[model samples]
Target: MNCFEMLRIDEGLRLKIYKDTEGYYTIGIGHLLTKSPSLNAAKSELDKAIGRNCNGVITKDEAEKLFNQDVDAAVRGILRNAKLKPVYDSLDAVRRCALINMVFQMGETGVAGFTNSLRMLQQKRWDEAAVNLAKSRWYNQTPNRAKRVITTFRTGTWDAYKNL
Candidate 1:
């Protein structure tokens, strides 16, 4: 399997900048904090990052390339931890993707903190695991996304969130 595919699997493709897990500005397949640290730094680092004075937006092609670059780095970070390797490798692709998605959202450290839910996952108790996933601050914060991920965990398929 290609590295980009594994990275892109969890992050639904997007072309615009969005707030990420820690509310940092992000774009292009989870490229967090590509701009500056703060508005005050915008003219310097941010402008430099965008290769302009202030305003710049990446096209879809650029976004795709950035995704390839950024996702490679992220995967390297995920692989470095090593503790989750066995667990991550043992699951079916969907479950593995679910775990990777959680890691992408919260980082390996944060995902590691989901002790009970991780246990449920380890046991392969899909329904219980989904329930455990729902009962979290992350779920409270993003119920729609949580639902989508939970559905994947429950059904082992990618189901985009549909507003109702």
Candidate 2:
């Protein structure tokens, strides 16, 4: 598994669907049945059980499959991102995964909103990028994870989050 996948899996794991804080149906490492590219793929791959509203249980294998597919979708989405793609390519494995992990939680559009930080990242202004990202609603929303990610950007190291 890539560090990207490991970080999201670190976010959560489960077989049963539960409504996320935003009220969107979620399952299997935070899979959003409400809407997402991974949801589209799951519609066919797990169509048997992927409820229209994500009100069902999934096998461990199914969960893992969803995560992998979600990882694929995330990577594809990132590659297609104009601003993020550049820095994404320039980043080390850890920082690259940092971008992927953020995309996993917020999607390309969401990450793209951090244009200034992305530029700083691309310029290797580590602290500037970290501080810029720190000044976001995302930081307010998930302080702990945000702090971890900020560390990844500033230090450019996965060693900061090795509980996986």
Candidate 3:
């Protein structure tokens, strides 16, 4: 069997949330509950299923499928927002990925709320956008990550950003 199948077996699939050996909440095939998007989405799906009077238990494969769908939807959201501006399309891969990562963290609408940053981006003002991004609450919440993304916006190099 493949490594994936073996991991599934090792983790032991479960349909309900329970504490792991470390006393942390977990569900499905080892999805941790601490600030995990997959865990949050899975819990919401489980609640929706129960509300609809449907079967509450999900198979390991089904949980995996749901996670994949969530990831695809997030990527599509980033792409949709990126396509709204010509400059976004013109950006290098590092800058593009940084933008996408920001959208992923804040959601498209949340990122849209950064009016100055978005305006700077539309005007092809990379330095201004980088500066504006650093001024936001996002930067206050996660300085290290924000620095890396801002560096990418400023320098357009993966190494420069990654090292930050």
Candidate 4:
């Protein structure tokens, strides 16, 4: 499924993911409910919430701006609703956390698109995971960020890319 499909959002409501002024790709939460009732009001609230909640996994600055409690809660919610438990559940705790962080930033649809990479990792196909990662749409949309998370998934260490 496409990212928007996986996220279960209508095309009009799916936030435009973009590189922000801070050099992080932020989902424009203000764009998330453009066609909904009380659009202006909802957008204002969502913008504030996104500013306070969603964050950059590799960008330390972005992380600093986020509300840790909200991030943690959202990550847990994503994990709870994840479809491929075997892949994520079998991961090392650190790797699992990293996955959650990425999902928190990119949303489950973005995470779900990494099916090949996840499967490779689940089967201990480390090199394949890296290769598959580079081939994803995310790699095209956010190359640096994708590379950072791929490295973390393979190496189990948070390198500089951890702040991509």
Candidate 5:
């Protein structure tokens, strides 16, 4: 219930480079190629990670590594946020995974804006927390995915996990 594989399924694995809905450069399982360094540098590293001589594509192996790093950063961000620490510490594995999935999708800044949701979650008010999520742009942007994550939060189950 760490959501490593589960999130991999949620964020479809793509070997090719493309832009996301907002036209930011993305590749290899929802990875933002412009996350850090220069775009060419980052892209080159992904190519280098798989020993592909500037092919502009990355392997699943690189994707998996990038996902792990991203997840780790999300986790770090969660623990580092003073307001989120106690809320995070109180959750079980599945709920924690749900939270991680939210951060994984929206990043720390966007997820941090859910003050009411996090507060409710901290108080063990699962349904209330989910209500807050349901009322967000993220929920509308990816309604189905949002439901799965909210369900995970609501039921404290890993129902978000779908087979590839």
Candidate 6:
């Protein structure tokens, strides 16, 4: 199962499970709490919710059983935030998956919060999208990650050796 389905968040709670809003393609629900609501707290909530609902930490077998379910949640989240149609309407699955991964790590509002970036993306203005993506607060906070995701979107290839 995808992480959200595993966690039982039925209403599209786009979980941002990373530090400094880093656009990392990570899973496993790690969290950290800041002066306010930190990543740990967020992860803790997810873990609690998942444990309560699904009965335990997700295992490989369990994950396989619900893979499509989780993918559905992820795709639904991406379409909802990007205001795009479903995966069938997406141009490239890899690019779309990359966006889903980034948004999953950064949360819907945070990822979709990039107004200019969204404009550029909708128009397929690659240069402008790259520029606007790199100009985000997240970009400033996580330069390496921002560079990687923007490059992935623009180039349509994930650098396997690069940091996710």
- Which structure among the candidates has the greatest lDDT? 5
Off by over 4 Å in 5: 21-25, 34-43, 50-54, 162-164
Give lDDT tens digits, candidate 5, residues 50-105: 66675667766777877777777777878999877888899998888888887777
Could you tell me which 10 consecutive residues in candidate 4 have the lowest summed lDDT?
4-13
Lowest summed lDDT over 10 consecutive residues: which window, candidate 5?
A: 34-43
Stretches of candidate 1 off by over 4 Å are 1-26, 33-55, 160-164
Q: Per-residue lDDT for 1-164 in model 6, tens only?
A: 22333223212222334344553322333322233444455545545644544322455443433444556676676665435443225446546655665655677666656666766676677787888787678888867656766776687665522332
**Global local distance difference test of model 6:** 0.52
lDDT of 3 by residue, 1-164 (tens): 22223224323556666667766555565555454445455466565643543234566566565444444565566566644355555676556666666665576787777877877876779888888888899999978667766876787766543321
Task: Tell me each candidate's TM-score.
Answer: 0.63, 0.71, 0.52, 0.53, 0.74, 0.55
Cα lDDT, model 1, residue 117: 76
Report the Cα lDDT for residue 85, model 5.
Answer: 83
**lDDT (tens digit, per residue) of candidate 4 on 1-164:** 22222112211222344444444333332122233345344435445655543321223332223334444555566667656567776888557755765675677777777767778888878778888878777678866556666776777765523222
Q: Single out the weakest 10-residue window by summed lDDT for candidate 2.
A: 36-45
Ranking by lDDT: 5, 2, 1, 3, 4, 6
lDDT of 3 at 2: 25
Reference-based lDDT, residue 99, model 5: 84
Q: lDDT tens string, model 2, 109-162?
A: 998999899999999999988889988999999998888888888998765666
C-alpha lDDT of residue 63 in model 4: 26
lDDT string, candidate 1, 1-164, tens digits: 33334445545655555666676666667766445556444334334665655443566666666666665565567667655655665678766666767777778798777777777776788899888888899999877657777887787765443221
Clashing pairs in 1: none
79 Cα displacement, candidate 1 (Å): 2.6
* RMSD to native, candidate 3: 9.6
What local distance difference test score does each model get? Answer: 0.64, 0.76, 0.61, 0.53, 0.78, 0.52
Kindly report which residue stretches of model 4 are placed more than 4 angstroms away from their true locations once superposed: 1-66, 161-164
Report each candidate's C-alpha RMSD, comma-separated, in the order given: 5.2, 5.2, 9.6, 9.7, 3.4, 8.7
lDDT of 3 at 120: 83
